C-alpha cells in the first residue's frame, strides 16, 4: 500500500478510473540496504533500472545527496547526474568519467562545532553537456542526530519516450528499523526531457570525518546510521480513488491476490458475499507491439482529388486504390473540403483499421444534391443516379468548385438522369440513351409528345446561389472482405515477442494474448480464424509468413467465495474447469467437488443449511 502516484493530470472528482502504467507491486520483496557505523556497511552497489525504481529512504541527518543515471558510466554514453550539495540542487547532463566509489565528504571540527562539506568526489571530467539546471542557493543543517529516523523520503522515477518524471513527498515518521506502512500519494515535481537510455543506476551517500576517525582518506571515515530501500516498477492494473480534494487516499490491487481482483472488477472498495469470475492465472502485460504490411508506397489520392476533368453524374468514374498506404490527415487538414459526415468510420480510427480495397468515385453535383448523396435519402439523384446501401462503409468528400466548372455562359457539359421507371440498385451506374416514354403508345425513338430524353442538362451559371453552385464530389467506398488487405494506414512496425502475455496489433485489431507457434495449415485467401466461441485465435502475420495462435493469458471461470470484507479478509477460491499447476497458489485444505476444486476452505463431514451456493449440492459457511 505504497508508491501510488498520479498517472494523469486530469482532475477527477468522486469517480474511479482504472489505468495501465508502470506501477509498484504490492507487498513486493524489496531489497534492504543498511549502513550502521556501530558494521562499516557502506553499500552503494550498481543495480539495473528495468522499468522504474521506487526509492524509500529513512533519513535523519541528510546522508543521501544525489543519484547517478546512465548506461555505461565510463564517459562513453550520455548520463544523467543529479546532486544536492550543501549549497544548491545541481542537475547536469554530460558524459562523466565516474569513479568506482563516488561519495561526498563532510568534515567536523573539534575546536568549533560546525559541519561543512569538504570533499566532492563524483566524476572526473565532463566534455560535452546538453542539459543543465541549477536551483536557488540554500543553507542545510548537515548535523548528526543521536535519535532515531525522523524524515521519510519517497521517490519514483519513470523513463517513457525520453521523459524523466520525479514524484516526491515528505512524511514524518518515528521508527527504528522498519518500512513505515501507510498511504501517501506522491505529487509531480519536475519533468526532465533527457532523452537518454538508462539501464543501471547507483546510490550516492555522504561521508563524515572528524578527529575520532584516524587514518588516511580511504580508511579514516565513518558511516553513521542510515537505511534505504529499492522497489521496482512493474506494469500492472490498478484502481485509484479520487476524493473532492483531489488527493489519492487509498487504492486497491488487481494482480496481488484473487480477493484483490474482486475489487478491480466490481470497482468498489467493499466486497459483498457472492461469486466473482476474477481470473485463473492472470499475467499482466509488459509490452505493446504492432504489425503491419511492409508496403511504403503512397496512394494516388492526388489524381482523384485534383483531376483536370470530372465525370458526369450518371456516368461517374470509378477508381480502385490498392497496394499502397493512405494517410487521411493531409486531406482532412487541407481546410478546403465541405462534407465530412461519415457513417461507420471515424477520423481518429481511420489511421488504425483498414479494409480489403478502397474505391473512389468522382462527379460534380450541387450542394442540395451533395446532402442527397447520403444513403437515407430519396429524390432524382438519391434514387435514379447513385444509390448507397444502408450498411455503407466510409463517406464522401465534397468541396467548393466555383472557380472551375463554369464559363461566361451556361456550362452545359454535365448531365444527370431525370426519368426512370424503376428504383436503382445500390452501387449501380446506368448509362442509357433510350427514349423515355410515358404514354401507352410505344415510342420508336421519336421526340414527340410523352417522349423525352431521360438526361437533363445542368445550368452551371456563375450567378447562381451557394446551394446551386457545382461542387466537386469524391466518394470513398470502403469494402472489407475475408481476403488479405493490400492497403492499410500508415503506422509503425515493431518486432515480434514469443511466449509472453503481450499486446498485439495485427491488421488493425488489438488485444491481449500470447504468441506461439502453430502447426495449422491455412488456405491462402483467408487471414483470420475463430473457435467455437467466436474468439480470434489465429493471425497470419504476412511480414514473416508464420501462423501464430492467440493464447489467452487467463481464461477465467474461477469462483471466489468471500464471507464478507467487514468480517475477515480470508477468502475461498473454487476452480470450475480444474480437476484436483494452474492455480494462483496451492495453499492448503484442497477439496475436490463435482462442480470443481475448492482451495482455502476446510471440508467437514456434517451437513448444515446452505449459506452460500457453491455448486453440485456443495455448501460452505464461515464458522469457528
Amino acid at each position: 500500500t505504497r508508491g501510488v502516484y498520479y498517472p494523469d493530470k486530469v482532475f477527477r472528482s468522486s469517480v474511479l478510473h482504472s489505468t495501465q502504467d508502470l506501477f509498484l507491486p504490492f507487498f513486493s520483496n524489496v531489497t534492504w540496504f543498511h549502513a550502521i557505523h556501530v558494521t562499516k556497511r557502506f553499500d552503494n552497489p550498481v543495480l539495473p533500472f528495468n522499468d522504474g525504481v521506487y526509492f524509500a529512504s529513512t533519513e535523519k541527518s541528510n546522508i543521501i545527496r544525489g543519484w547517478i543515471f546512465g548506461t555505461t558510466l565510463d564517459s562513453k554514453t550520455q548520463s544523467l547526474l543529479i546532486v544536492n550539495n550543501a549549497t544548491n540542487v545541481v542537475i547536469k547532463v554530460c558524459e562523466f568519467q565516474f569513479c568506482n566509489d563516488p561519495f561526498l565528504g563532510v568534515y567536523y571540527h573539534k575546536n568549533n562545532k560546525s559541519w561543512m562539506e569538504s570533499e566532492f568526489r563524483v566524476y572526473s571530467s565532463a566534455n560535452n553537456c546538453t542539459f543543465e539546471y541549477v536551483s536557488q542557493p540554500f543553507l542545510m543543517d548537515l548535523e548528526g542526530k543521536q535519535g532515531n529516523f525522523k524524515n521519510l523520503r519517497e521517490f519514483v522515477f519513470k523513463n517513457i519516450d525520453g521523459y524523466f518524471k520525479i514524484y516526491s513527498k515528505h512524511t514524518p515518521i518515528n521508527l527504528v528499523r522498519d518500512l513505515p506502512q501507510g498511504f501517501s500519494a506522491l505529487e509531480p515535481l519536475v519533468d526532465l526531457p533527457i532523452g537518454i537510455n538508462i539501464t543501471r543506476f547507483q546510490t550516492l551517500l555522504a561521508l563524515h570525518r572528524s578527529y575520532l576517525t584516524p587514518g588516511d582518506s580511504s580508511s579514516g571515515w565513518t558511516a553513521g546510521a542510515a537505511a534505504y530501500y529499492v522497489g521496482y516498477l512493474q506494469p500492472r492494473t490498478f484502481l485509484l480513488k479520487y476524493n473532492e480534494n483531489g488527493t489519492i487516499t487509498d487504492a486497491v490491487d488487481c494482480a496481488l491476490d484473487p480477493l484483490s481482483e474482486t475489487k478491480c472488477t466490481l470497482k468498489s472498495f467493499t466486497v459483498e458475499k457472492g461469486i466473482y469470475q476474477t481470473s485463473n492465472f492472470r499475467v499482466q502485460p509488459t509490452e505493446s507491439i504492432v504489425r503491419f504490411p511492409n508496403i511504403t508506397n503512397l496512394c494516388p489520392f492526388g489524381e482523384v482529388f485534383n483531376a483536370t476533368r470530372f465525370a458526369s453524374v450518371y456516368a461517374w468514374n470509378r477508381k480502385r486504390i490498392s497496394n499502397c498506404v493512405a494517410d487521411y490527415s493531409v486531406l482532412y487538414n487541407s481546410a478546403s473540403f465541405s462534407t465530412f459526415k461519415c457513417y461507420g468510420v471515424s477520423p481518429t480510427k481511420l489511421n488504425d483499421l483498414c479494409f480489403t480495397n478502397v474505391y473512389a468515385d468522382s462527379f460534380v453535383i450541387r450542394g442540395d444534391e451533395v446532402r442527397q448523396i447520403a444513403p437515407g435519402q430519396t429524390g432524382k439523384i438519391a434514387d435514379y443516379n447513385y444509390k448507397l446501401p444502408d450498411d455503407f462503409t466510409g463517406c464522401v468528400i465534397a468541396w467548393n468548385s466555383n472557380n472551375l466548372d463554369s464559363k461566361v455562359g451556361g456550362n452545359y457539359n454535365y448531365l444527370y438522369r431525370l426519368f426512370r421507371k424503376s428504383n436503382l440498385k445500390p452501387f449501380e451506374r446506368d448509362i442509357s440513351t433510350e427514349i423515355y416514354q410515358a404514354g401507352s403508345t410505344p415510342c420508336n425513338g421519336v421526340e414527340g409528345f410523352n417522349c423525352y430524353f431521360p438526361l437533363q442538362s445542368y445550368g452551371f451559371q456563375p450567378t447562381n446561389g451557394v446551394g446551386y453552385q457545382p461542387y466537386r464530389v469524391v466518394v470513398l467506398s470502403f469494402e472489407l472482405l475475408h481476403a488479405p488487405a493490400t492497403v492499410c494506414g500508415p503506422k509503425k512496425s515493431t518486432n515480434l515477442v514469443k511466449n509472453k502475455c503481450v499486446n498485439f496489433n495485427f491488421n488493425g485489431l488489438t488485444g491481449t494474448g500470447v504468441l506461439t507457434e502453430s502447426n495449422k495449415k491455412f488456405l491462402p485467401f483467408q487471414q483470420f480464424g475463430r473457435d467455437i466461441a467466436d474468439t480470434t485465435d489465429a493471425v497470419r502475420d504476412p511480414q514473416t509468413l508464420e501462423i501464430l495462435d492467440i493464447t489467452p493469458c487467463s481464461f477465467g471461470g474461477v469462483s471466489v467465495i468471500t464471507p464478507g470484507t467487514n468480517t475477515s479478509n480470508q477468502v475461498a477460491v473454487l476452480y470450475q474447469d480444474v480437476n484436483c499447476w494452474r492455480v494462483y497458489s496451492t495453499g492448503s485444505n484442497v477439496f475436490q467437488t463435482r462442480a470443481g476444486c475448492l482451495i482455502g476452505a476446510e471440508h467437514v463431514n456434517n451437513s448444515y443449511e446452505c449459506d452460500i451456493p457453491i455448486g453440485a449440492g456443495i455448501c460452505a459457511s464461515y464458522q469457528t
Partner: antibody
C-alpha cells in the same frame, strides 16, 4: 391529347379525413412526375406534394405530416389521403404532370371546404 | 428558403402596349423559370418554360429573357383573350415548387 379528371372534393369537418381520386388519361401515373398544386381562393398557387415515377414522394413543410400519396396501377388513378385537416386547408386542389421543374398537363379542380 | 416576389400586381395596358411583367428571386437561378396563365374560373396553363423557350400551342407573343435574377414576360401585342394572371415558378433540386405572386392585367377605363 391529355386529360385529367378530379373527384372527391366537397365539405368535411375540421380534423377529418378526405380521400381524393385523380384519374389520368393519355399517360401513366407510375412513369412520370405527379404534382399536387393547391391554390387558395383569392391567393396565388402553392405547392403541396409531389410523386415521382418510383416509390418516393415529397411534401411541403406545412403539409409534411397528415399527408399520404398512394398511386394505383390497376385503374391508373392517383389517390391522395389526408387524415387530418386545418381551417387554412380550404382551397382548390389540382393534380398535374410535370416534366421536371415545370408542369405541362394541368386539369380541373375539386373544392375542399372545412367549417364547423 | 426561396421567396419569389413579383414587382407588378395590377398593370393596365392597351392593345398596342407591353405589360413588362417581371419576377424576382432571393437566390440566383439560371434559366429555370416557367410562366403560367390562369384564367378566372379556368385551369392554369403553361406559357413558357426554361425562361427562353416556348410551349407548343402558345401563340408566339409571350417571350422571356432572364439570366440569373431578373426575368420578364414581355408581350409584343396584347390580345383581349389573354387577360389573366401570371406566376413565376422555380423548382428546387428536389421537386419542391415555389410559385410566386399573381399579377393581373386589366383594360383601361
Amino acid at each position: 391529347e391529355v386529360q385529367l379528371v378530379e373527384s372527391g372534393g366537397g365539405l368535411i369537418q375540421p380534423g377529418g379525413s378526405l380521400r381524393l381520386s385523380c384519374a389520368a388519361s393519355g399517360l401513366t401515373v407510375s412513369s412520370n412526375y405527379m404534382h399536387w398544386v393547391r391554390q387558395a381562393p383569392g391567393k396565388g398557387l402553392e405547392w403541396v406534394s409531389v410523386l415521382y415515377a418510383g416509390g418516393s414522394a415529397f411534401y411541403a413543410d406545412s403539409v409534411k405530416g397528415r399527408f399520404t400519396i398512394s398511386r394505383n396501377n390497376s385503374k391508373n388513378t392517383l389517390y391522395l389521403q389526408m387524415n387530418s385537416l386545418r381551417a387554412e386547408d380550404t382551397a382548390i386542389y389540382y393534380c398535374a404532370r410535370g416534366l421536371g421543374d415545370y408542369l405541362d398537363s394541368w386539369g380541373q379542380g375539386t373544392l375542399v371546404t372545412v367549417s364547423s | 428558403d426561396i421567396q419569389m416576389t413579383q414587382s407588378p400586381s395590377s398593370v393596365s395596358a392597351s392593345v398596342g402596349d407591353r405589360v413588362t411583367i417581371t419576377c424576382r428571386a432571393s437566390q440566383g437561378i439560371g434559366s429555370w423559370l416557367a410562366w403560367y396563365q390562369q384564367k378566372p374560373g379556368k385551369a392554369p396553363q403553361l406559357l413558357i418554360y426554361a425562361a427562353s423557350t416556348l410551349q407548343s400551342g402558345v401563340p408566339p407573343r409571350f417571350s422571356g429573357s432572364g439570366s440569373g435574377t431578373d426575368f420578364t414576360l414581355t408581350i409584343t401585342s396584347l390580345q383581349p383573350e389573354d387577360f389573366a394572371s401570371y406566376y413565376c415558378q422555380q423548382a428546387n433540386s428536389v421537386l419542391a415548387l415555389t410559385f410566386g405572386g399573381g399579377t393581373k392585367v386589366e383594360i383601361k377605363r
